């Protein structure tokens, strides 16, 4: 934690970014570049840049 929720799906286009699917959870290594944050998602257990306005803090 702590624990961001994806709110909807995302396919990656670049090299470091990270596709995702509506429900993946996240724990936010770097959230310091306001749109792009890394992350890594505790379903696929992977590592890579996702949009910032496409998740949520889980609660």
Do not use: C, M
Not at 9 to 18: G, N, S
């Amino acid at each position: 934690v702590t624990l961001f929720v994806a709110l909807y799906d995302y396919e990656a286009w670049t090299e470091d970014d990270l596709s995702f699917h509506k429900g993946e959870k996240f724990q936010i290594l770097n959230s310091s570049e306001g749109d792009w944050w890394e992350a890594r998602s505790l379903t696929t257990g992977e590592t890579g840049y996702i949009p910032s306005n496409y998740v949520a803090p889980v609660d």
